[PDB]
Design a binder for this molecule. Sequence first.
Ligand SMILES: NC(=O)c1ccc[n+]([C@@H]2O[C@H](COP(=O)([O-])OP(=O)(O)OC[C@H]3O[C@@H](n4cnc5c(N)ncnc54)[C@H](O)[C@@H]3O)[C@@H](O)[C@H]2O)c1
Ligand SMILES: NC(=O)c1ccc[n+]([C@@H]2O[C@H](COP(=O)([O-])OP(=O)(O)OC[C@H]3O[C@@H](n4cnc5c(N)ncnc54)[C@H](O)[C@@H]3O)[C@@H](O)[C@H]2O)c1
Ligand SMILES: Cc1cc2nc3c(=O)[nH]c(=O)nc-3n(C[C@H](O)[C@H](O)[C@H](O)COP(=O)(O)O)c2cc1C
Ligand SMILES: Cc1cc2nc3c(=O)[nH]c(=O)nc-3n(C[C@H](O)[C@H](O)[C@H](O)COP(=O)(O)O)c2cc1C
Lengths: 495, 501
Amino acid sequence: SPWPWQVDEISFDIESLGKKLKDLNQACYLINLGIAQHPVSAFAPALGTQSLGDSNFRRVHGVKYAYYAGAMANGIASEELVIALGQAGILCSFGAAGLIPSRVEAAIKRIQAALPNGPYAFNLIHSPSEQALERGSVELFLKHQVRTVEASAFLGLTPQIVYYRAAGLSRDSGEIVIGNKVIAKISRTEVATKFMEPAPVKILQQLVNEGLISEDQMLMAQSVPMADDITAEADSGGHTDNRPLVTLLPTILALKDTIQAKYQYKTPIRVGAGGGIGTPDAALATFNMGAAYIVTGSINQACVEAGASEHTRKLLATTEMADVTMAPAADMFEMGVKLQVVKRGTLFPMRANKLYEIYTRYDSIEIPAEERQKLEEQVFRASLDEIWAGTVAHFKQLDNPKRKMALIFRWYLGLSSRWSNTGEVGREMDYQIWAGPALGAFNAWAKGSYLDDRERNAVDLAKHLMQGAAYQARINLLLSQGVSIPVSLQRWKPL
Amino acid sequence: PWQVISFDIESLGKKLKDLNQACYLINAELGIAQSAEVSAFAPALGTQSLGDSNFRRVHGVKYAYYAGAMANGIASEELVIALGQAGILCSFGAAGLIPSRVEAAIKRIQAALPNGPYAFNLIHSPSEQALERGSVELFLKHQVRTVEASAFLGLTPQIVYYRAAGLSRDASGEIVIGNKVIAKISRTEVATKFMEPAPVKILQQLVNEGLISEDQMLMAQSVPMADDITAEADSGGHTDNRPLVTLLPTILALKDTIQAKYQYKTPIRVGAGGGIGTPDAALATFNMGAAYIVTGSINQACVEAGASEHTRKLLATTEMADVTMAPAADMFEMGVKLQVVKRGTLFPMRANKLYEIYTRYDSIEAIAEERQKLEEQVFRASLDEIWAGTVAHFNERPIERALDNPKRKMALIFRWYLGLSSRWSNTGEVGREMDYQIWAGPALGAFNAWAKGSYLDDYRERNAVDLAKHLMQGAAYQARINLLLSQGVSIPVSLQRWKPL
Ligand SMILES: NC(=O)c1ccc[n+]([C@@H]2O[C@H](COP(=O)([O-])OP(=O)(O)OC[C@H]3O[C@@H](n4cnc5c(N)ncnc54)[C@H](O)[C@@H]3O)[C@@H](O)[C@H]2O)c1
Ligand SMILES: NC(=O)c1ccc[n+]([C@@H]2O[C@H](COP(=O)([O-])OP(=O)(O)OC[C@H]3O[C@@H](n4cnc5c(N)ncnc54)[C@H](O)[C@@H]3O)[C@@H](O)[C@H]2O)c1
Ligand SMILES: Cc1cc2nc3c(=O)[nH]c(=O)nc-3n(C[C@H](O)[C@H](O)[C@H](O)COP(=O)(O)O)c2cc1C
Ligand SMILES: Cc1cc2nc3c(=O)[nH]c(=O)nc-3n(C[C@H](O)[C@H](O)[C@H](O)COP(=O)(O)O)c2cc1C
């Protein structure tokens, strides 16, 4: 046919054909039901996991895969998880969000002790109201030389994130060296533009004025982008817009090309993608869409290294595709913001949505007493007044009727995640567990495997998705050439 | 491995776009040649290499592609005949149409396409089994041998009847599937029922009513209820807003499980729709890997579609942010919602208001600061005027049940607006443009973005066959680019994507 080869009698056994196919190190010569490593009808080259993604991403972050495990709040993306993945040459971002500085600093030491030469990243979340908490974290990272952050939840540039970026700039031949790297996670084009563009001169100038950065650093900062890597986050667990991966990522890739042509950075900007990736199929499709790297995910909270209770991790292994839903978010409850949570084996969603329903419909906690009793009785397990007293002790504390109601309600929204993380007994039906459909897709893919179990390791999962993607790229390639592959061999299974 | 050409960017771009000829790439001074005795190589793989070849065989079509059904004849005879003439499968929008109308369509379409291809939408009527039975009867009578079954929550005697009746043996004793079913689903529970053989309880009853034979009942237990399973992700109209990248993989896994168990002679095929308006999305879905891809919101924007000029013109400016969820007419009381355009129309806002009022109040007595606004802006008549007229509509269907219940009366009045709103958009009813109900998903906005700065900016230049061609050709072209990129080659950014030139 199209091929310049011949072979002498190959292998004709399905379990010899299956084994040879899964070897991505050796090329495949297919003869019409025979595989070898007289004529040749189909051919598949030797393409491993390294043919997926942007090689520059791997080079720059010193990682073995174009893959990174996204941050998970309140230390769910824990030190154990980061160290486990870091030791395998896989990038993971530490879930610093919601943790106190002393806690985060502790993590920096452990992690840096375990991984002197990387790789790891730290999540730098945007605190729009508490601007100092953001400053403390940047200072903490600069002090301990944390040279990679995943910046997320940003709506615009802030002096702190610009400061972090600019401070890591230096010269070698006079070429610019980007010491501090930024992965900006976005779902909107407006925000992505600001991270693909050089830092604004106005903010730069201010930092030079305060002796935070040098003049040559201000000069350098105008010639390089704010972020090296841009993660388009599609529909996902926790906070999300629920945007489609297949529309979002292409929009951001186009945006990238536009800005790259304009500023013509020496090192190109890279766009990766996360959101809904729990199987090799999806992983491969995302790569072929143009993604430099792929991001997970809900599947990582289900692993043993994660900072989630045993009850929760066990529950996540049974969660299916339709077992997730949207529920009021604690921090942006009044504004109607929602996040994606598990709704199976937990009643938090129903109860949290009830609070929002009650909050929007009624003027004060002084609400029908038939309705009020149920809340105190089942949800809060205390008088609304008893709950209020404790909120005051925690804390914005009185003039407004609706604002008071919200603060009491937020007691449940806030705690509910803490219960799931720590494993608070007797509050299981109230666990707030963030997850997306990706987890259910993974559980479906993994059904009837060792992974049905305590047997779930983040490194193993990464390896499957990466190897699975590479294998299925080969299968697709062969199918495209009219070769008939046994249905049982077309997909990567965990076995 | 063969041995060492053109360097002209225009020649490189042109040669790359020829999927019929192989590509020999040399990196001096990249060089591309179509003859050899070689840094990178790309074989000749056209649109025929995407999808499941069996899907094309079985439906006698050029592409692993089908234009999904659009209700009330939006997927019109014109659209079906246009796509059928190009060897592309299209499903006729029978939903909501009266039998005499559907029969008319069968003739026109069968006259134009004696040997296919086409399909007819068989929608689930939970409320009235008579509408479903009449349609199955109509299809069996006129030998409509392909239906797209959608909106089903599980098996129904009618859909089982349709499937079983088309079963027969060849001289060799093998089972021949005469009537084909494409089941469109978004849940694993429902997909299982269509991937599994028909239940004997329902089968036996059909044998007892003389509808099918005993050997047909026997055959029906060794073949699946559907040949093709369309996983419908986030899409226009009715949807539960699921991600394509999680749903399709879940259904493919489910497929493999059931295939291993029953080991059908001809395997089940799982295809996918929902959010496909660009070559990028098309290729990703294939890569995932679907047997076929389905559209879509982009088809309602084409000239062949049964949508008003005002609507089609509006759809050419619709962006991804311009769609939202609104109460559905058929399932208004149950709180069901569907995805509609919210740009250039106030239907969504007004329809959501009706649901708010319906759930909060016991009867139209007593709503009247609110009541006046509805009468004033939405209905443009008194609620009483609307109630009458509705009485005339259902009297020559019974209304009798509504008198006993004020809640049922309120809903029936409200549904006057929910129902006619789509009719206005379809017909192009003047003076009610701000009330048009237009079903669409994010895929349309993605298409409009992809097509900007091209001849397709003009709605008048939008043809279903041309769109199908772009998505299929675009996907095939970009698969080649990916293949080359993976072979370590560097392709000019301007050539990496299929653009409608
Ligand atoms: N997918 C994502 O991006 C994602 C997912 C989860 C969380 N996050 C972010 O990470 C962090 C998670 O932290 P969080 O929001 O769970 O905690 P938080 O501290 O941000 O919670 C804020 C709410 O907690 C309530 N609260 C907590 N403890 C209380 C107590 N003892 N008494 C009364 N009220 C109390 C407060 O009233 C407040 O309204 C946040 O920044 C969140 O925005 C992001
Ligand atoms: N994606 C999808 O699956 C999808 C999308 C759109 C529609 N559909 C299906 O298409 C079909 C189209 O039906 P539909 O929902 O447009 O309307 P319909 O024919 O189901 O009738 C809608 C309701 O509107 C009211 N109504 C309609 N016309 C009226 C009049 N002249 N006077 C008074 N009241 C009137 C009645 O209450 C009626 O029950 C439905 O079966 C729907 O389920 C499916
Ligand atoms: C429990 C949980 C907590 C998360 N916390 C954060 C966070 O604090 N900051 C952040 O940027 N992303 C957070 N994410 C998002 C992930 O980093 C990643 O972007 C997303 O989960 C990928 O989509 P997927 O979950 O559908 O794979 C969280 C995700 C989950 C499931
Ligand atoms: C205006 C419109 C009407 C539709 N009507 C029907 C219908 O009556 N029956 C049906 O099964 N699907 C219907 N669909 C769904 C399509 O057949 C197709 O499955 C879906 O639009 C694909 O998703 P996409 O719009 O994101 O491409 C309709 C879609 C649109 C946009």
